[PDB]
Amino acid sequence: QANQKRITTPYMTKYERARVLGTRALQIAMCAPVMVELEGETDPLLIAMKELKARKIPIIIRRYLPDGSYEDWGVDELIISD
Amino acid sequence: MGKRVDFSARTVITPDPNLSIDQVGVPRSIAANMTFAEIVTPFNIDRLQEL
Amino acid sequence: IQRRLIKSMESVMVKYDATVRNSINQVVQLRYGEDGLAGESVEFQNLATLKPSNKAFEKKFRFDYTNERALRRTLQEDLVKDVLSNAHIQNELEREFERMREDREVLRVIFPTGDSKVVLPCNLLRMIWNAQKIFHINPRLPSDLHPIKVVEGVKELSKKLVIVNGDDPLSRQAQENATLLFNIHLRSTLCSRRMAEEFRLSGEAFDWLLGEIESKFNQAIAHPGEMVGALAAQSLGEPATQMTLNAKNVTLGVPRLKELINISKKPKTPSLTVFLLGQSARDAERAKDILCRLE
Amino acid sequence: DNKKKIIITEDGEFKALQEWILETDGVSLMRVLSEKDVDPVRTTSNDIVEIFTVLGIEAVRKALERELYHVISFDGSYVNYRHLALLCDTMTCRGHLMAITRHGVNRQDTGPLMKCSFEETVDVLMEAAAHGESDPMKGVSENIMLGQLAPAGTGCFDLLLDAEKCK
Amino acid sequence: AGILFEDIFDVKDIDPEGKKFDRVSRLHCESESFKMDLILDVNIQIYPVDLGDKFRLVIASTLYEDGTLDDGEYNPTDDRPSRADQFEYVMYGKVYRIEGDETSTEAATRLSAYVSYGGLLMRLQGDANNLHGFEVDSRVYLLMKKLA
Amino acid sequence: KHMVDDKIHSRARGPIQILNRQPMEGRSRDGGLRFGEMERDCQIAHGAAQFLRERLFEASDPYQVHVCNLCGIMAIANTRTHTYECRGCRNKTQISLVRMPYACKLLFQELMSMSIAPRMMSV
Amino acid sequence: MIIPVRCFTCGKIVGNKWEAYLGLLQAEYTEGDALDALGLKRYCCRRMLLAHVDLIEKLLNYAPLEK
Amino acid sequence: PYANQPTVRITELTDENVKFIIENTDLAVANSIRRVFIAEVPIIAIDWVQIDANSSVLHDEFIAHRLGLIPLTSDDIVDKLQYSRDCTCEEFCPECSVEFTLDVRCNEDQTRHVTSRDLISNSPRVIPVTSRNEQDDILIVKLRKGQELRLRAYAKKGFGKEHAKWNPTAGVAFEYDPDNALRHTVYPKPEEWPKSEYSELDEDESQAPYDPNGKPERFYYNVESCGSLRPETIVLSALSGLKKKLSDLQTQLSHEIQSD
Amino acid sequence: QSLETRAEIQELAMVPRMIVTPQSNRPVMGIVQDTLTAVRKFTKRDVFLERGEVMNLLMFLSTWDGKVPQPAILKPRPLWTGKQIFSLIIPGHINCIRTHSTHPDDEDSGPYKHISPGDTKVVVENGELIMGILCKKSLGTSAGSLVHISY
Amino acid sequence: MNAPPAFESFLLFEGEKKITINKDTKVPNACLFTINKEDHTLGNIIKSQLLKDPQVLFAGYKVPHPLEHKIIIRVQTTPDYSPQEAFTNAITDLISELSLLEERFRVAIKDKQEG
Ligand SMILES: [Zn+2]
Ligand SMILES: [Zn+2]
Ligand SMILES: [Zn+2]
């Protein structure tokens, strides 16, 4: 599939947001480096949401198409609504 | 398709005008029986040692 | 019935190409709900060009650029001079009205009964009211919004509301169809005349309104991964728990719902609704003659 | 007005003509339609099977949507049309009237494990054994039974670590 | 001054439709100096008003005798000279509608300003000359005093 | 008679049933609450796939089996000596670990009891 | 089973009034006049005396466990 | 910005109740006084029981609960005794508790009424009210021949917030504005309602004319005593307790202000 | 029992995300028994609150900016109205038109359309309850109510 | 099973402060007094006494949850005054009022028993 033309939505779905936040929160809880600055946050979920708001989550969403191909979107490339 | 699960609780429900819509008032015995496995980090090492 | 519906639709889902498909990957709907919109964001609205007469439709939606003093009351001086002098603008507004009249006929064939209640994503009247109050629009003073700006902005907005993505002619036609009803509602609500003598928005208010419509529409789009089949089974089974178990007698409620979902070769009260063509539709004697020829 | 004749006057207004209509206690849509002074355009029936036999799959799709809407809304309720449309497309997407029963749901190519979850567990699995059927694990039931992430909602995609951005 | 309107009104009717609320009463009044109709909702429990009464009504944009805007916030510890001192009944509300007899081409000869004092509604309708001070979504005061 | 103290119940990793290694039934048995078919359907509608997997796999009866990559039938594993072999295929190198519910393993074994061959093919 | 000590509502002592209440009733008082004689003026305490069922008198018809 | 100057007028004083009127005070002060009558006026009540023998038809907790609700004369002793929280002794001592003993055995053929008269105390000042030197004695249990009840109770200092057995009142009637002049009530049909005992209205008049400038003043009280304290002792102890609550609050307030 | 499932529930299944149902594109939860009878009584035209009562009620607003609003009646005695406090409860700057259940059907035709004698015809503007008695039609689970428009 | 001891409504837990003062940042010259192990009995009188101070702009209290045993009293005063000073003066005034009421009730009792 041509990465120059990705047909899927440029928005992050609610399910993508949910799973990305959960995954990154688990990664933080397992002592992964944090990409944003931290005032006093110790809850991995809060840190993951701060990273998502900052657009600094190092995860790629591989969206599968019904035909079998896939499209890779960086979390910073998608439009975060909520 | 359906099965019994751990980390579940059940009791009678009761009104509480002083909870927000997204809150649930839980007894201390249900909460003392049920547990959440929290991973240790330097961010929470002290609090989890306290617990 | 609830369990049966769930097991029948459980794996139907909105895919990342925005089609609704089952587990076999067969296509159930090319776009969810024929419009690719989620059911939480839509809401009840009214099509303003459906019910009115031809005279009323003309009077309410045809921008009148000949009445100098009426334009002087609605628009500012430079806008009035540009509207009265320029003929390019006048042709733009004329084609706007022709497009709205075509939309009127399309609605008339879509809704053969005169029911303007429709369910659409963005509550345009509420957004217009929000813009009126956010920018402190004075309904008594002439507006600084150029009707050509209204036409151009609505056209660009319509281009930005995309349910089906693609420049190919097939994607173009599917895009036309997916947002047809909403674009008709939008062109009849954000009309240049209504925006000039009804809403009286300013340029700032209109630009904010366009952005708000675009954002809320993009928010109403269904998300890939929505289990619309399980959701629909629940949406149809939950009301079934309230409706009752028990001229002519017609079966209704859970018994009729059962007869429908599990295809019954012997309905409880099979019936026709025969409609008459000519004078039989008006007079009772010939209607009785047809009744005798049927019974 | 739902049964009146709604026309558009020459002035462009919707006008509800009050006309005679007949309601029968049986159905011969095939015959009644082909009668003099009977409207062959609006005359319909509530027996969806006859609508399918006489008018076809898209006609029965529309009629079935109408009848389900009538059942739902008769008590004043309202259901979003996309749910009725999805149910009606499920029952008509394969060219025939697919009942929501074992006779319609377990007769499609959904895979033996999805079918055994619904009804006829033993018969379905035994038929699949006799015929060597293979379940591709595409539905949610099959993955749920095997304890795998259902391709549903948060499971309809994969996550990959971004090596170039961890810096 | 900060006064949008001032006139003397005469209570011509009280609750034509009947008493709708116990402590609130609707007065249909007419002035003499300007020929303006008035519908007014008043708390008759604390400020009773009888049929045929005569009062001075003053719609103002502010209470301070000097031209000075208000913040819409309650400041009971305010020692400035307020014009509420010269009146008995004072309410505080906002204009939520201005109707008129305007056409597509002609301006309005008669206006109709609608004000809501926390739900107590007022309609002051008459010549458009006397209602230029009223603008929708604008806060005003009632400043009403009974006279013999 | 219905006092709350006779109804309140909670569970966190208590006893399990013998046949299917799932939580017991009842307060008296310190059992777990049933996450039934309707709860599964509700969470499918929610789109919560990991929560659904937690409730129907990880909070009920997590289990592991060893499958032959050739015949897809549960193999014989010996983790102490690390010797895995399928008696059917007579191989001991192409075995794979599969994390499945215990109830699903029990189902597949009760199907093999019926001469049905449910072959879990990992490719 | 036995007369409560306090009125459930107010907390007035009614435990010392059951025997006097019965003695007034066998003295051909009406229940209302008897309750007035004992000073039960609130209808809560009148409820306490008027609705009491002395079950202990029936439980004392059984011989105890030890002689 | 300063305190009220309330006045008092006692309209009836018996051994059973005190009926008085407080004027020129706020409704909040009046209701806090009313609440303290019920919930923060300490008294002595049995709060510890040890059943050595109970062959009666009522189980042990029944007898214990029943003993806890017997009022004990607390007039001068309650101020002297300490809370067992504050006592520096073991479980009990005479500075924070009063010992009672009860030992009854039905040997005779008629039913034996174990009453509050059988609660024998070590302290002569703290005794059951009915046993004080008419009203009969509170009935603890009826015993049949061969039944026996022997127990040892300890009475403690507490107030009604902890348990209603430490509540000294047998009803606190509280009222204000008997004629509905403030219109804090709104009678749909004012003619249908009976007149308050404190009303001053002619019978044709149902309620007083509405007072727009009015505030609740002149609160009427009828504090009925369960027996432990005298009614006037209940009122005086209520005022003292409320004042000490406020004094402690002010002490802690001063510590918080100065610590900042 | 995991951060991933916790995030899933927090981002998908939390109750505020569940206020509007896709079944019928309206709220699924609304104001209910005591709060609904009481808000009906509270937003009547003749509900006047005193300064202490108003402060008592403002203690229970979580989303309060700490500014006491100017009372609707300044003289002879400061009085706030129930609509004036519900205006503080109403969030944002939402705009809503509804009609109380007792709204006569022949009132929107005659005069007094915008000044309702019965205090029917709910009108909220810029997040202030300009007029009308709130009820099931305004705070219930129907479409276009204040709770729906707020969501 | 879950019944708290009845003394928990009145008794302070170890390390728990009777009163805590927190500056309210929404408006100036406002404070929140979180008082533990008190209820409407003191909250209502303190609020109503604070309302008698013309230098007090706001005085309110709430019991955030009946099952919990604390109150919060919000006090806003004029800029020249302080909410802590207002709260102190309110308590002083209540104490003086109750002392006067107690002395006058003693006098009334003495008159009633004597004549
Ligand atoms: Zn093998
Ligand atoms: Zn009583
Ligand atoms: Zn001691």
Swiss-Prot record, chain I:
PTM annotation, UniProt: The tandem heptapeptide repeats in the C-terminal domain (CTD) can be highly phosphorylated. The phosphorylation activates Pol II. Phosphorylation occurs mainly at residues 'Ser-2' and 'Ser-5' of the heptapeptide repeat and is mediated, at least, by CDK7 and CDK9. POLR2A associated with DNA is specifically phosphorylated at 'Ser-5' of the CTD by CDK7, promoting transcription initiation by triggering dissociation from DNA. Phosphorylated at 'Ser-2', Ser-5' and 'Ser-7' of the CTD by CDK9 (P-TEFb complex), promoting transcription elongation.
Superkingdom assignment: Eukaryota
Subcellular location: Nucleus; Cytoplasm; Chromosome
Description of how the protein assembles with itself and partners: Component of the RNA polymerase II (Pol II) core complex consisting of 12 subunits: a ten-subunit catalytic core composed of POLR2A/RPB1, POLR2B/RPB2, POLR2C/RPB3, POLR2I/RPB9, POLR2J/RPB11, POLR2E/RPABC1, POLR2F/RPABC2, POLR2H/RPABC3, POLR2K/RPABC4 and POLR2L/RPABC5 and a mobile stalk composed of two subunits POLR2D/RPB4 and POLR2G/RPB7, protruding from the core and functioning primarily in transcription initiation. Part of Pol II(G) complex, in which Pol II core associates with an additional subunit POLR2M; unlike conventional Pol II, Pol II(G) functions as a transcriptional repressor.
Entry note about domains: The C-terminal domain (CTD) serves as a platform for assembly of factors that regulate transcription initiation, elongation, termination and mRNA processing.
Function: Catalytic core component of RNA polymerase II (Pol II), a DNA-dependent RNA polymerase which synthesizes mRNA precursors and many functional non-coding RNAs using the four ribonucleoside triphosphates as substrates. Pol II-mediated transcription cycle proceeds through transcription initiation, transcription elongation and transcription termination stages.
Annotated family: Belongs to the RNA polymerase beta' chain family.
Protein name as annotated: DNA-directed RNA polymerase II subunit RPB1
